Design an enzyme around this catalytic site. Structure first.
Site, short mmCIF file in Angstrom:
data_model
loop_
_atom_site.label_atom_id
_atom_site.label_comp_id
_atom_site.label_asym_id
_atom_site.label_seq_id
_atom_site.Cartn_x
_atom_site.Cartn_y
_atom_site.Cartn_z
N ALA A 79 0.83 -1.22 0.00
CA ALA A 79 0.00 0.00 0.00
C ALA A 79 0.87 1.28 0.00
O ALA A 79 0.46 2.31 -0.60
CB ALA A 79 -0.87 -0.05 1.22
N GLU A 123 1.90 1.61 -3.82
CA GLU A 123 1.02 1.43 -4.99
C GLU A 123 -0.09 2.49 -4.97
O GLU A 123 -0.42 2.97 -6.03
CB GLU A 123 0.40 0.04 -5.09
CG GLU A 123 1.38 -1.05 -5.51
CD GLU A 123 1.98 -1.06 -6.92
OE1 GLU A 123 1.91 -0.02 -7.64
OE2 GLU A 123 2.57 -2.13 -7.29
N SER A 178 0.05 5.63 -3.91
CA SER A 178 0.71 6.91 -4.23
C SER A 178 1.06 6.92 -5.71
O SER A 178 0.80 7.93 -6.35
CB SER A 178 1.95 7.09 -3.38
OG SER A 178 1.60 7.63 -2.14
N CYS A 220 -6.81 4.67 6.94
CA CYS A 220 -5.45 4.46 6.38
C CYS A 220 -4.34 4.84 7.39
O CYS A 220 -4.34 5.97 7.87
CB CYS A 220 -5.26 5.37 5.20
SG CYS A 220 -3.66 5.21 4.40
N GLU A 279 3.26 13.14 0.11
CA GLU A 279 3.90 12.70 -1.16
C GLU A 279 3.13 13.36 -2.31
O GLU A 279 3.77 13.76 -3.29
CB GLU A 279 3.88 11.17 -1.32
CG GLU A 279 4.86 10.36 -0.44
CD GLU A 279 4.80 8.86 -0.70
OE1 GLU A 279 5.55 8.09 -0.08
OE2 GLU A 279 3.99 8.46 -1.53
C1 HEM Z 1 -2.95 8.25 -1.71
C2 HEM Z 1 -2.62 7.35 -0.81
C3 HEM Z 1 -3.57 6.44 -0.20
C4 HEM Z 1 -4.89 6.18 -0.33
C5 HEM Z 1 -5.87 6.85 -1.25
C6 HEM Z 1 -5.19 5.10 0.58
C7 HEM Z 1 -6.49 4.58 0.79
C8 HEM Z 1 -6.82 3.69 1.81
C9 HEM Z 1 -8.11 3.27 2.17
C10 HEM Z 1 -9.38 3.67 1.50
C11 HEM Z 1 -8.02 2.46 3.23
C12 HEM Z 1 -9.19 1.77 3.98
C13 HEM Z 1 -9.48 0.33 3.60
C14 HEM Z 1 -10.66 -0.24 4.36
O1 HEM Z 1 -11.01 0.28 5.43
O2 HEM Z 1 -11.27 -1.28 3.98
C15 HEM Z 1 -6.64 2.36 3.55
C16 HEM Z 1 -6.14 1.52 4.54
C17 HEM Z 1 -4.78 1.27 4.63
N1 HEM Z 1 -3.79 1.94 3.98
FE1 HEM Z 1 -3.97 3.42 2.81
N2 HEM Z 1 -4.10 4.78 1.27
C18 HEM Z 1 -3.10 5.52 0.84
C19 HEM Z 1 -1.80 5.50 1.23
C20 HEM Z 1 -1.24 4.54 2.03
C21 HEM Z 1 0.10 4.53 2.45
C22 HEM Z 1 1.15 5.55 2.00
C23 HEM Z 1 0.23 3.40 3.24
C24 HEM Z 1 1.41 2.90 3.96
C25 HEM Z 1 2.52 3.61 4.15
C26 HEM Z 1 -1.03 2.77 3.29
C27 HEM Z 1 -1.33 1.68 4.02
C28 HEM Z 1 -2.64 1.35 4.35
C29 HEM Z 1 -2.88 0.26 5.29
C30 HEM Z 1 -1.84 -0.64 5.89
C31 HEM Z 1 -4.21 0.19 5.45
C32 HEM Z 1 -4.93 -0.80 6.32
C33 HEM Z 1 -4.95 -0.20 7.75
C34 HEM Z 1 -5.81 -0.91 8.76
O3 HEM Z 1 -6.47 -1.94 8.45
O4 HEM Z 1 -5.79 -0.48 9.95
N3 HEM Z 1 -1.91 3.51 2.55
N4 HEM Z 1 -5.93 3.13 2.68
C1 LIG Z 2 -2.66 -6.85 -0.32
C2 LIG Z 2 -2.57 -6.31 1.11
C3 LIG Z 2 -2.80 -7.44 2.12
C4 LIG Z 2 -1.54 -8.18 2.52
C5 LIG Z 2 -1.81 -9.17 3.64
O1 LIG Z 2 -2.35 -8.74 4.67
O2 LIG Z 2 -1.48 -10.35 3.47
C6 LIG Z 2 -3.56 -5.17 1.40
C7 LIG Z 2 -3.21 -4.42 2.71
C8 LIG Z 2 -3.72 -2.97 2.55
C9 LIG Z 2 -4.56 -3.03 1.28
C10 LIG Z 2 -4.95 -1.73 0.59
C11 LIG Z 2 -5.67 -0.78 1.54
C12 LIG Z 2 -6.14 0.48 0.83
C13 LIG Z 2 -7.04 0.13 -0.35
C14 LIG Z 2 -8.38 -0.44 0.12
C15 LIG Z 2 -9.31 -0.75 -1.02
O3 LIG Z 2 -10.53 -1.33 -0.51
C16 LIG Z 2 -8.65 -1.71 -1.98
C17 LIG Z 2 -7.33 -1.14 -2.49
C18 LIG Z 2 -6.32 -0.79 -1.37
C19 LIG Z 2 -5.13 -0.06 -2.02
C20 LIG Z 2 -5.84 -2.06 -0.62
C21 LIG Z 2 -5.18 -3.10 -1.54
C22 LIG Z 2 -4.73 -4.36 -0.80
C23 LIG Z 2 -3.80 -4.03 0.38
C24 LIG Z 2 -2.46 -3.47 -0.12
#
Ligand code: HEM
Ligand SMILES: C[C@H](CCC(=O)O)[C@H]1CC[C@H]2[C@@H]3CC[C@@H]4C[C@H](O)CC[C@]4(C)[C@H]3CC[C@]12C
Ligand code: NA
Length: 396
Positions: free
Chosen positions: A233, A236, A238, A345, A354
């Site tokens: 995440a 990808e 960003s 997130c 970024e």
């Molecule tokens: C433009 C940048 C980004 C967007 C639009 C985005 C969007 C999202 C969204 C919509 C979710 C919620 C998923 C759900 O609740 O089902 C999420 C969760 C998450 N994102 Fe992002 N994200 C971004 C950047 C990043 C970055 C930079 C990281 C890591 C450095 C990241 C790591 C994660 C992780 C690990 C979760 C799961 C967190 C959890 O379950 O507590 N994302 N993101």
């Molecule tokens: C593949 C990864 C799981 C690894 C594991 O646990 O084994 C998961 C962890 C965080 C996830 C992303 C979170 C943000 C976005 C949410 C949206 O509803 C769908 C797209 C979005 C970019 C996800 C894609 C799948 C990710 C990268």
């Protein structure tokens, strides 16, 4: 059963399927068949409902890990992943790495991140115009940032981008193909944390290695799987989001010209295009009601799965005036581009920084920037859980 298949349609550019506006007006909560698992799910298209599904302990993601539960992606969910944890297990898992992602510690990265951007834009003006903004900025910049934050080697990119590309499949790859890549990424990340054994590092993989034998309340699977989650995440989203915001800016050049004129409007612009851009192709990790929960038009029953469309909540006409219009001077913007509730997130401040530093540099250095490849020929990514451009040739 005659519940519609969801997604309804293959996506087009950065367009919303027009069925979302219809659903928000007349049937904000509707039953759909997700492409994997068995049975039906509720699709939530309105912001108030999305805040309940994402925001309430009565909706569990741990409950969604059964291979039979509807889901948007071909493999059953990883039970050790942060998305598949409910609080308080989830809260303890987030503390493994949360210190690094606070608004305060991300703001401290701005000097190194600005400097990374400038170096890559220096390299792009060396190639000269026109050049592919994917190869020169959208890929190398986020990749460099997540590699220095985690402590993944930069020369290991083609390797982990191959892995990320497969694990972001909606329909491009089969379950079996993705299962194999998940195992490969697992042992790769486990080897990266295991090198910190008699060699502790000052990076997030360093923190994951100390947790491997100082926590007794976090499993090794959960710890290694956090590394895999952040590496995918953490770049990808960003990568795609840079090409998405640039596409919105150059297809009505009025927007780009507005930021060239007042580069201080970039942070607000980023929040508006976060709201506007359907980065997430369709649905969401599934939440299963553990009790009956009242949404706007329906009581969801204990055991009924639900899915949110983030982009549709971000176009709710009850939350945002002229929702279907791009407005960098909007006064309130409580978007859920980054989700809501426990799974909000973790990287939201890093994605913001970024996107701010990438557009600000562009808008300052390249006022003449235009798309130099026909819009009809743009290579939108197909069959992935996110949308974005394979390539974006620009001139200046
Ligand atoms: C433009 C940048 C980004 C967007 C639009 C985005 C969007 C999202 C969204 C919509 C979710 C919620 C998923 C759900 O609740 O089902 C999420 C969760 C998450 N994102 Fe992002 N994200 C971004 C950047 C990043 C970055 C930079 C990281 C890591 C450095 C990241 C790591 C994660 C992780 C690990 C979760 C799961 C967190 C959890 O379950 O507590 N994302 N993101
Ligand atoms: C593949 C990864 C799981 C690894 C594991 O646990 O084994 C998961 C962890 C965080 C996830 C992303 C979170 C943000 C976005 C949410 C949206 O509803 C769908 C797209 C979005 C970019 C996800 C894609 C799948 C990710 C990268
Ligand atoms: Na799911």
């Amino acid at each position: 059963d005659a519940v519609p298949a969801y997604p309804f349609s293959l996506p087009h550019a950065l367009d919303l399927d027009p069925h979302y506006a219809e659903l928000r007006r007349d049937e904000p909560v509707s039953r759909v068949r997700l492409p994997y698992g068995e049975g039906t799910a509720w699709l939530v298209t309105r912001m108030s409902d999305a805040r309940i599904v994402l925001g309430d302990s009565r909706f569990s993601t741990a409950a969604a890990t059964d291979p039979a539960t509807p889901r948007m992606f071909p493999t059953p969910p990883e039970p050790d992943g942060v998305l598949a944890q409910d609080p308080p297990d989830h809260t303890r898992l987030r503390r493994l790495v949360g210190k690094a992602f606070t608004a305060r510690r991300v703001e401290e990265m701005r000097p190194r991140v600005r400097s990374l951007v400038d170096s890559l834009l220096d390299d792009m003006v060396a190639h000269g115009s026109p050049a592919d903004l994917v190869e020169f900025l959208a890929v190398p910049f986020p990749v460099a940032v997540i590699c220095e934050l985690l402590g993944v080697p930069l020369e290991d990119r083609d390797l982990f981008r191959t892995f990320s590309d497969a694990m972001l499949s909606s329909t491009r790859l089969t379950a079996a193909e993705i299962q194999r890549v998940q195992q490969d990424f697992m042992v790769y990340m486990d080897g990266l944390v295991a090198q910190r054994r008699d060699a502790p590092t000052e990076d997030l993989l360093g923190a994951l290695a100390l947790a491997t034998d100082n926590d007794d309340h976090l499993t090794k699977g959960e710890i290694v799987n956090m590394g895999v989650s952040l590496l995918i995440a953490g770049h990808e989203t960003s990568v795609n989001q840079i090409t998405n915001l640039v596409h919105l800016l150059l297809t009505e050049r009025k927007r780009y010209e507005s930021l060239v004129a007042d580069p201080a409007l970039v942070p607000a612009a980023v929040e508006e295009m976060l709201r506007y851009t359907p980065l997430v192709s369709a649905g969401s990790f599934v939440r299963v009601a553990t009790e009956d929960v009242e949404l706007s038009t329906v009581t969801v029953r204990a055991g009924e799965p639900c899915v949110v469309h983030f982009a549709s909540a971000n176009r709710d006409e009850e939350v945002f005036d002229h929702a279907d219009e791009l407005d960098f001077h909007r006064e309130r913007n409580p978007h859920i581009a980054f989700g809501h509730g426990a799974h909000h997130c973790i990287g939201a401040q890093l994605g913001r920084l970024e996107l701010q530093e990438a557009l600000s540099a562009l808008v300052r250095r390249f006022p003449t920037l235009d798309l130099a490849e026909p819009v009809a020929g743009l290579k939108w990514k197909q069959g992935m859980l996110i949308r974005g451009l394979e390539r974006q040739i620009v001139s200046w």
